[PDB]
Structure 1
Amino acid sequence: GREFGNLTRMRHVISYSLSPFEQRAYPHVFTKGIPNVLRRIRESFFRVVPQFVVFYLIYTWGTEEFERSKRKNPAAYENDK
């Protein structure tokens, strides 16, 4: 059906490609690799993190408040006097 012999038509778009053995498996890793990952992280960062940061505040609060809810047993007896 949708085999390679019959898909989308396209017209003169030339392309170029080296043999795997003709080139290094790790081209310019430091000069270009790491900064790319850093740019990518800088793009995703503000989109992703803050909700999780919001989650943490709630997580901390919930445990802490529950601590006030229970561990502050003495507040109730203190209320008794």
Structure 2
Amino acid sequence: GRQFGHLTRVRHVITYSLSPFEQRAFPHYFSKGIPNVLRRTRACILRVAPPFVAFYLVYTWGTQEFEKSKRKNPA
């Protein structure tokens, strides 16, 4: 039930925009793009990766332990 012209109050803010036909869709796509993804990765790796390596270690150990347990030796 929310409409433009009724959302909120904003004062003293200028927005400059260009037409889509004046500008490139892929402005500096690799030159600026790659540096950004690396920066985004660095920012989040310590938050995202360590639970999944913790999954990976419990996976690797668990599969190994199950394999070894269904072998005998001195009996």
Return the TM-score normalized by structure 2: 0.90
Tell me the equivalent position of 2:53: 53
1:69 matched to which residue of 2?
69
Bigger CA radius of gyration: 1
Q: Following the alignment from structure 1 to structure 2, what is the Cα–Cα distance between the partners of residues 2 and 61?
A: 54
How many residues were matched structurally? 75
Matched, 1:4 2:10: no
Q: Which residues of structure 2 form unaligned runs of 5+?
A: none
For residues 34 and 69 of structure 1, what CA distance do their matches in structure 2 show? 47
Please identify which structure carries the higher strand content: 2
Distance in 1 of aligned mates of 2:42 and 2:5: 41
Q: Which segments of 5 or more consecutive residues in structure 1 lack a partner in the other structure?
A: none
**Percentage of pairs with the same residue:** 69
Query: Which segments of structure 1 move beyond 6 Å, counting only runs of 4 or more?
Result: none
Residue by residue, what CA displacement relative to the aligned partner does 1:3-45 show, whole Å, maximum 9, x if unpaired? 1121101112111000000001111123211101110011111
By percentage of residues, which structure has more helix? Answer: 1
1:28 aligns with 2:28: yes
Q: Distance in 2 between matches of 1:2 and 1:63?
A: 54
RMSD of Structure 2 on Structure 1 (CA): 1.1
Give the TM-score normalised by the residue count of structure 1: 0.84
